[PDB]
Write a protein that binds this ligand. Structure first.
Ligand SMILES: O=C(O)CCC(=O)C(=O)O
Ligand SMILES: O=C(O)CCC(=O)C(=O)O
Ligand SMILES: [Co+2]
Ligand SMILES: [Co+2]
Lengths: 361, 361
């Protein structure tokens, strides 16, 4: 397992969502989980979101994958960036574990860039927190003060990253990175909803479930000098209906569990055929087999319920469920007596048959 | 003009959104604004929403317009119902004026039914308030107590309506009406949003305007024993973001003005060609011409702004604008000095060119 040398309370107190910082030797003896060639290969696949970025003579150029080849690209001034490699490559997903000191619901995916000297995407800022882990090679990273693609900035951090160095950047800090030597960078990205996404999502939920069917009612309709007027008390009442629908706590929790447990990038969903019967799940677990969560699959506990990729999961076996949320790899011990409950077993079978968890690989 | 004999404070105190009631002789010497033949003719048009409802030997049958003919229908047991005749026929729109004792924003449209003896749509309840005005002929109306198409009920009102009688029904009271003699009924309908429609609309508004771009921020991210958990304080914060976006008062007002001023039925939008220049509007008004609001067009005042068919209207000429909201027919006096303001004139020209108001007809 990858192991951070970070002082976490320090980082949280001084840097998280406050100030960028180079974590020198964040990882000791850093070994890359994937090679440039493997990355390129991955970028050859259609299910994978990737891009190639180039710059020559002052002018940029972006291409989107999949790429049939790379036959002629150049020695310098380009970079291949692949989103969510952790959805497609397990060793890569291992890089994200140490960052579980921060909450799962806030973590996004892992983006990998390979760059030849000069390669990079130019000066910009992002709306999300990011840890950029330096793998093989070397890159110059610059970060300016809080103000996509921005004007040139005066740097407050200007560093050459070495294998195992990590650059943390809060949202809104302009930054710029380019390779000095053939370089792999691993961006553990975070994600945070905005209010627009929240109200949109919740509205979709309410439409789908046919909730909020209560009509404005006015047996005490107020008088007005002008019949076309809409009075502030009526407005206040309608507004209050809206707020009240939002404050129905159980519905709020269910909607948010479904909303937030969805991923921002395509998952490698491969439903088993033929489907698993509950008995197979039982037997396999009892025989000591490991149930593995699909890479990038979001699984979060909200109250007593667990939410996996948009689906709610409810069971009177609390520790087993919590095991589903916390553990990437699972064994019979994690579930305990819950495996004797056939309703629970059928639930696990449904999850596996959806391709959300798989045995061993 | 049609004139109600109703005691309005009584009706509001005892009946509005509380209890159904037959208003005997609501109108004196009631003259129908439209004939059965004209209604049928209207139902022959494609832009018009209508239906024919029949019952024979225990079994119902519904057909939707437009109808090429009525050649063979029967002497009995059917009814033609046309939605929003006030969108298509001015004398009909005149029936709605007396009901402006209730707020414009709560009023819907006017639906007209013609029925031969036995004709009617059967026992049902509605989610909106309605005044059913009896025109020519006679109908038996029954209304049961608060509980679409319902089981048979024990009536609390069971009356034969005569020309000029009006049956008021609050939402949720089952009712049943059928003709005794060839009968015209005029339903002045009301409408009230539900919470689902409100949050949907507001969400659409926020998406369209790109509002709510503020991201959840957690420099004070709370500790947890389990990394997959989502804590109640974080939930409370997200919820609070939602509520706060809803409570931005000016945005709330604009969104609601745009939302509520839309009609539930197709309008007769006929943009003039060639378009009116502001000067023509000025001249026509100055010469004494009458500017007429399009039938069914919703125009409502919210704060200082006026909203017409989804469009916001802002002008430092308050009385003129208020005139746009309150008056169906307008003359130069209604606008006063505002007509000397070319920005205002251009505004009127835009409204007319959209077909929202027209000169004289
Ligand atoms: O790995 C890279 O070079 C790019 C990382 C980055 O800052 C971004 O794409 O937002
Ligand atoms: O005019 C009619 O017969 C029908 C009125 C009514 O109750 C309805 O359609 O909801
Ligand atoms: Co960036
Ligand atoms: Co009805």
């Amino acid at each position: 397992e990858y192991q951070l040398t970070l002082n976490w309370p320090d980082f949280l107190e001084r840097h998280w969502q406050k100030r960028p910082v180079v974590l020198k030797r964040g990882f000791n003896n850093f070994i890359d989980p994937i090679s440039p060639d493997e990355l390129a290969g991955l970028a050859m696949e259609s299910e994978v979101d990737s891009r190639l970025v180039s710059h020559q003579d002052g002018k940029w150029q972006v291409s989107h994958g999949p790429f049939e080849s790379y036959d002629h690209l150049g020695e310098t001034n380009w970079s291949l960036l692949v989103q969510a490699v952790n959805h497609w490559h397990e060793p890569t997903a291992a890089l994200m574990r140490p960052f579980r000191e921060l909450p799962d619901w806030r973590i996004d995916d892992l983006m990998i860039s390979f760059s030849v000297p000069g390669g990079g995407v130019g000066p910009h800022l992002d709306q999300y927190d990011v840890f950029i882990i330096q793998g093989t090679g070397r890159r110059r990273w610059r970060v300016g003060e809080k103000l996509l693609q921005v004007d040139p900035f005066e740097a407050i951090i200007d560093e050459e990253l070495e294998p195992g160095d990590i650059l943390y950047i809060p949202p809104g800090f302009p930054h710029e990175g380019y390779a000095l030597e053939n370089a792999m960078n691993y961006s553990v990205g975070f994600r945070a909803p905005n209010t627009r996404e929240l109200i949109s999502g919740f509205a979709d939920y309410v439409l789908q479930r046919e909730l909020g069917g209560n009509y404005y009612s006015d047996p005490d309709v107020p008088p007005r000098a002008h019949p076309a007027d809409v009075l502030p008390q009526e407005m206040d009442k309608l507004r209050e209906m809206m707020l009240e629908l939002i404050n129905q706590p159980e519905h709020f929790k269910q909607w948010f569990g479904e909303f937030i447990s969805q991923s921002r990038h395509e998952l490698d969903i491969a439903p088993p055929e033929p489907p698993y019967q509950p008995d197979e799940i039982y037997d396999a677990l009892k025989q000591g087999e490991v149930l593995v969560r699909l890479g990038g699959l979001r699984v979060l506990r909200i109250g007593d319920d667990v939410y996996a990729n948009g689906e709610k999961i409810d069971s009177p076996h609390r520790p087993a469920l919590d095991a589903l949320a916390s553990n990437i790899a699972l064994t019979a011990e994690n579930f305990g007596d819950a495996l004797e409950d056939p309703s629970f077993l059928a639930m696990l079978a449904a999850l596996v048959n959806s391709g959300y968890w798989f045995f061993e690989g």
